[model samples]
Target: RGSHMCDAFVGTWKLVSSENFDDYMKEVGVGFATRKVAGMAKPNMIISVNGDVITIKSESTFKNTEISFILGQEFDEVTADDRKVKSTITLDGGVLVHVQKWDGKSTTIKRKREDDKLVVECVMKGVTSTRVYERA
Candidate 1:
């Protein structure tokens, strides 16, 4: 049932739009100039699953980031900003909730499938950002 939902996430997604990203980045201590630069980078992501392991790779003109981990397993992560974090991703209902903790703070990210689109929600320090993508 719910386990099959993860299969829906296996595809290439192109960034179509974003909302409240600046506010969310600011809450995470990203400076104005870098925020502006980051806000302009529209990244495309490829997601795939092999058995119980999930991998996501995102590429853009500014920078590229890739992450791979097993569902429900905690692992060390170095964020794009170079911050070290303890992170885990768990599937609940039909959504994958990714939680990261660093420097006594935490961020929660949720990836959901809606219709033919992928919706990503990120929250840090009470600020939330929404990103929408379509199959690429």
Candidate 2:
């Protein structure tokens, strides 16, 4: 099935490292207070798949966010920062490309497997942040 394309990502992952996340949040227009809280939070990602739907959940002490959607389908998403945007996710050679757009602004998050870790790259307004996760 097509869902198998995301098999590598269907697991629980714990954040092990983060870099330049504060600046990335600033570029996305997140408030200073929120950025402070977000910068200190280490979220665990739970990824799963069923049929044509894939779900990615971020769980942390500060907040939890979840999104379930079919690949290539556009849907509304309320980000952890409370920004409402249109989001779409697609698989490209084993990498998940997530794009969100709102109010003429956009951000792209690319999730890929590197060795035994899940590496996420968040990009907005020329700022790029990297977050690495290990299986949990």
Candidate 3:
């Protein structure tokens, strides 16, 4: 079968583990109440691609968010915390590098496939959070 660079990311994944997510959110200026609610959210990430457009959907009990864009193209995004930012996703080797910029701040999230899992690393300020997902 033919394969694409984003093939590994095109599927539904269930959140298996998360580390230091609250601190990451806090650094991104998420409020206390939203952080509390977000801390409890184990969102499933659904990824799909149509031609040159890639879409990532985050689904959880608390809230759901989605974004679709072509690689390297920047678009406006309203994050789960209600922060409006310019977001971009690019493919670097086998990893998907995503950046969200707002005001004078920015955050980077890298997603890659390891073994049978999807690993996401989110960074803001000096804080980094890791979230792992299993194929669902």
Candidate 4:
């Protein structure tokens, strides 16, 4: 709920929701049916971050992808470079906030660990998508 600089956003996560998930996949060249399922199917991320080194395994029923990165390292082949979804991650008030940089624009994936809630934020194209999960 508040920002705290603590290394708490470390762990794997699963996707629970997305705003206009279909449009998102479509923009990535996913076909109509694929997009539909990718949209309907919840995507998830299993992540790890330590001193800037980061890794995330993003998965869905239709597809799955992984990312290995370091903060501020501006890479060209993160997550196999299939991650047209670029981003940066930081710890804000015990919360893991990730700012995704893409196509000259950016999205913020705010992940927070609150007692038992893992809050996720996805900001893209002027829209912010928020999803939450319980530690599994």
Candidate 5:
């Protein structure tokens, strides 16, 4: 393994657009008001890397979140909805694949680069959400 694998993700990204995120939020049991707020949120992710460890800081006007993980390692994570889960991240080609399992439910978040934008597909409870981000 070499540093080139994760280098593409080491930058700040701004949200461009999203689709089907409301359905995924509903499946996650988020309240209507919270969902409304989240729907309007344009979060930015500042991703940094230190060897195999990667840290992502999600910035938003409402609230900000931060997470760090090492590739191929599973760690307990708490989501914005306050739900706890075990998350594992892996690099497949140029895509960063993230998997989470909690209370017998599972979800997948795949991040990949498309041109100058970052495309993310989130799947939860059979519902899929697509989000696009541009490098900032």
Candidate 6:
């Protein structure tokens, strides 16, 4: 899976526009006020992929975090420089996908390129969220 899809993403993509992220926070147990703050925070993401290994960074004035993962390799996560984490990266479609497989959580992060745009969908637990970015 990752053998093919991951290669296509093995480059740098910048942050662009994002949508439907508020509802996703709700699905992940983020409170209403928190969702409101997240809605207005204007978060952006940077992605880098190398083979089965991938890296992603979400940037914002209020908060930010970066994660690195390898395809099919399960690890941990501790978010926002909080601590070390356990997580994993896997390939789904043409997207170099990742999700937190530890730290008592789970989600599916899909990164793909359509034309000149980079798209990312973060589906955590029972919630689904989508965001789109452009090349810089």
Which candidate number would show the highest lDDT if scored against the true structure?
2
lDDT of each: 0.89, 0.95, 0.93, 0.58, 0.88, 0.66
Q: For residues 5-123, what per-residue lDDT tens digits would candidate 2 score against the true structure? A: 57889999999999999999999999999999989999999999988888999999879999999999999999999999999999989899999999999999999999999999999
Clash count (model 1, backbone only) = 0
Candidate 6 residue-wise lDDT at 56: 73
| Worst 10-residue lDDT window, candidate 6 | 78-87
Candidate structures ordered by lDDT, highest first: 2, 3, 1, 5, 6, 4
Model 1 scores what on Cα lDDT? Answer: 0.89
What lDDT tens digits, residue by residue, belong to model 4 across residues 75-114? 5444322456655555555565666555675555676776
Model 3 misplaced regions, further than 4 Å: none
How well does each candidate superpose onto the true structure, as a TM-score? 0.93, 0.97, 0.96, 0.64, 0.93, 0.71
Supply candidate 6's per-residue lDDT for 131: 75
What lDDT score goes with residue 108 in model 5? 93
Q: Model 5, 1-136: lDDT tens per residue?
A: 5667678878999999999999988887779988998889999999998877899888997578888999899998888777798999999988999998988888899999888888999988689999999988
The residue-by-residue lDDT of candidate 6 on 1-136, one tens digit each, is 4465445555545556766787777666667666676677656666666655577777886578777776687766766424354666666666676665545756677877888777778897667776777755
Candidate 1, residue 4: Cα displacement in angstroms equals 3.6
Worst 10 residues of 3 by lDDT: 1-10
RMSD of every prediction: 2.1, 1.2, 1.3, 4.9, 1.6, 4.0
- TM-score between model 2 and native: 0.97
What does the lDDT read for residue 36 in candidate 3? Answer: 97
